[PDB]
Amino acid sequence: TQSLVSSMRGTLDKLKLIKSMTPMYLQQLAPVELAVIAPMLPFPPFQVP
Amino acid sequence: MLLEPLLSGDPRMTQLAIQYQQYNGRTFNIIPEMPGSVIADCVQLTAEV
């Protein structure tokens, strides 16, 4: 019954421009951590392409 | 509050501007000219000394 375009767009913009550094962590540091502990596991990795 | 609106984000790349858009798609922009600041200039002067 009321226009929500202005408020809907504002909320979406804030989520798009949030200062999260998880994406840069997953791309750079997470692979290194997984590679380091991999040879030490009791159950060695088992993967499919 | 002073500068709190700006610290809710990454301050390494800051700028200020505003715009609005018509229904046919035209846009109008306002980019204010940054004036000088005596305090920042004095701080740099102390750095040289």
Sheet strands (E) in B1-49 = 18-21, 27-30
A17 interaction partners in chain B (CB closer than 8 Å): 9
Nearest to B31 by CA among B44, B17, B41, B20: B17
Count of beta carbons in the 10 Å neighbourhood of residue B9: 13
Torsions phi, psi of B30, nearest 5?
A: -130, 115
Q: Is B5 on the interface with A (CB under 8 A)?
A: no
Q: Is B10 on the interface with A (CB under 8 A)?
A: yes
- What percent of chain A is helix, strand and coil (3-state, nearest 5)? 65, 0, 35
Collect all residues with Cβ–Cβ distance below 8 Å to B21 and sequence separation of at least 6. Answer: B27
CA distances from B29 to A16, B19, B20, B37 (A): 22, 5, 7, 25
**CA–centroid distance for A28 within its chain:** 11
Residue in A with minimal Cα distance to B9:
A19
Q: What is the resolution of this structure in A?
A: 3.0
Q: Is B33 on the interface with A (CB under 8 A)?
A: no
